[PDB]
Amino acid sequence: MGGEIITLQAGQCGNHVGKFLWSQLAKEHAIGTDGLSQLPDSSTERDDDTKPFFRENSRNKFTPRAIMMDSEPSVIADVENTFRGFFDPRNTWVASDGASAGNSWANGYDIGTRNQDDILNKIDKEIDSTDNFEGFQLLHSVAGGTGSGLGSNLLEALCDRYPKKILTTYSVFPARSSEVVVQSYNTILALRRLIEDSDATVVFDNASLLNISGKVFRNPNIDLQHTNQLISTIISSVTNSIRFPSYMYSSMSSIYSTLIPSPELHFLSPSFTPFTSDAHKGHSSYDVMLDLLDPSNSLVSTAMNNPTYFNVYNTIIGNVEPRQISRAMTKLQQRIKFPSWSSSAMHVNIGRRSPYLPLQPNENEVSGMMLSNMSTVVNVFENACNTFDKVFAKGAFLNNYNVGDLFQSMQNVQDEFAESREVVQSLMEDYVAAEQDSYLDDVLVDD
């Protein structure tokens, strides 16, 4: 019904984000940079750590249940040089040949099979560390071909090796229209495999996150190192129900059960309230959540063309009042649109503000986050669509990326590419069918 979770970084994007994640998690549980408890031990609070994410030793050191992979060994090292004792290097690995690393396609897809044993040895050793295992969570970028290729080979390998486990990822694509021409093969292929696993992902283009970081932090010079903070608050809060569990959610299996009824459409679009990751909204518990639906604070391309929702999940944290939020739920119900097919209950949990954070001067500074399954999420990587359409439709660049003796024949390259485009189109076919009411009659009226 739940179990332990091993996280994964694959490519430098997950290391830059990863240092923000680990820093915030360390604050959340008084872990420190060396991984050791920073608290006097009073032997109180059963949720003083999260068994699912850390391995606690005799020093009260919390070893992350995580594996770090990159193609750039200096990024792995710099995160290890930040987590100065916290992140244990035995689970890190670099997938690299300096010559292949600059080739986003070849680096990832060649290592995914060539180095499958190095990739798997860290993974299999950690999964076997426990009995009550639930799943994996990866930090990625479809643009990050290193991650696309090893991630794709793991998506398929882990589905086969561990048929009942949960395999997911958070994937950040750069908000760039022309820098994605060269990415036309690895980003579409990342999708070619992401669509194959119903647990796979929460997706974002960093478009609004970049603009958000430039308005909220006192730093208009928007960059990744000033935007990964926003990524950190949105991803850190996801597991609040695991880290500080209550009744409905304690695990990914539970979250899954209520958020993605259709294994086919697992791709989510995130948003958040002000946060303290790097913040005090000044509103009631119902107002802070209503703002989560406002696209101007969407973390991805903002305004959607009247998006149809298939399922919305929210978590509210702070002095939450069920009656106040009833105004919010009523109001959200009149903004969220759907066919009777997706007229599901919306699910909102209540999380907990960690006891190891600076005491909140006002408990009513309620924060929160939203994850939603919408038809217009396909617009998140529209920039990739623009360039892969130009490229794939022409049979452009077949093996001009030095395919690693896989599909070495140009037709075979085009056939792999065709499958990746079949996936792009089938993704929207399911999002459109999902907008139908008749979807329900197909297996209820008919036999």
Binding site: M1, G2, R46, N132, P245, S246, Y247, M248, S250
Partner: protein
């Protein structure tokens, strides 16, 4: 020792018998006792922790426990037979 103190305080008012001063002692005695009692209930008998625990287990306040219990007990519960070991 507590009693000895109060015994003396009440004994010392035998000349008044039942009166205002007696009542004053009673009011204070009560407060001292209850305040005491409630420290030991929580400090020695873990009274609030017990209460929270009951909520957490019988009212199922914490589901990680219940999930762990059911899954480990899946064969126990699944087995239809009574007199399981």
């Amino acid at each position: 020792e507590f009693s000895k103190k109060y015994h003396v305080l009440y004994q010392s008012n035998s000349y008044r018998g039942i009166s205002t001063n007696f009542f004053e002692i009673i009011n204070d005695q009560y407060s001292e006792i209850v305040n005491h009692t409630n420290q030991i209930l929580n400090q020695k008998f873990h009274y609030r922790d017990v209460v929270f625990a009951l909520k957490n287990i019988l009212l199922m306040g914490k589901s990680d426990f219940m999930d762990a219990l059911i899954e480990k007990a899946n064969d126990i519960l699944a087995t239809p037979s009574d007199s399981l070991p």
